[PDB]
């Protein structure tokens, strides 16, 4: 009972942005469920959304550890130690989010913006192409790709990518 009282406590929380209050709800949790993943992957999301990106990565390695085969957590790990600049860090978790799932699109996106940061322009144009051949929808995959060519001088691609993402945004915008 104590879980889900304080699991409901701390999300109500976070909602309404009492992140130090829904950190203390959800510590409560832990205090009894030390192996509470869900608790686990809410407490890395809001240190990450405090700016304490170490803590985060801390409650996420518990949550990993407890449930080696989620993708999302693996994300939200790769995104955490981009944060603080760990960036093979960033690309081992990432590509292990993407190992358990190929299809995940925010995974390989994120992954060319960690290449991106390294200078490693070219794997990270086909990181973005991978997330696009998910998603054709991605529209900040074509804007990346599109400043990556910008980056390249090769500027009339970058613009074709520049209108592609307009394309994509004029869609969505219509319904
Ligand atoms: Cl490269």
Not at 20 to 42: F, H, Q, S
Not at 159 to 170: G, H, N, S, T, W
Request: neutral net charge; proline residues 2%; without cysteine.
């Amino acid at each position: 009972e104590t879980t889900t009282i304080y699991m409901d406590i701390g999300d109500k929380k976070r909602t309404k942005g009492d992140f130090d209050g829904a950190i203390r709800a959800y510590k409560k949790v832990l205090k009894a469920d030390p192996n509470n993943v869900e608790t686990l992957l809410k407490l890395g999301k809001t240190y990450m959304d405090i700016g304490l990106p170490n803590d985060a990565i801390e409650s996420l390695k518990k949550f990993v550890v407890l449930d080696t085969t989620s993708a999302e957590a693996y994300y939200i790990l790769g995104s955490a130690n981009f944060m603080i600049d760990e960036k093979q860090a960033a690309i081992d978790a990432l590509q292990r989010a993407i190992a358990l799932n190929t299809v995940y699109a925010d995974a390989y996106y994120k992954l060319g913006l960690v290449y991106d940061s390294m200078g490693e322009h070219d794997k990270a144009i086909e990181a973005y192409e991978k997330t696009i051949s998910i998603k054709p929808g991605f529209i900040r995959a074509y804007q990346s790709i599109g400043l990556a060519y910008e980056g390249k001088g090769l500027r009339d691609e970058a613009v074709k990518y520049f209108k592609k993402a307009l394309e994509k945004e004029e869609k969505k915008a219509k319904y």
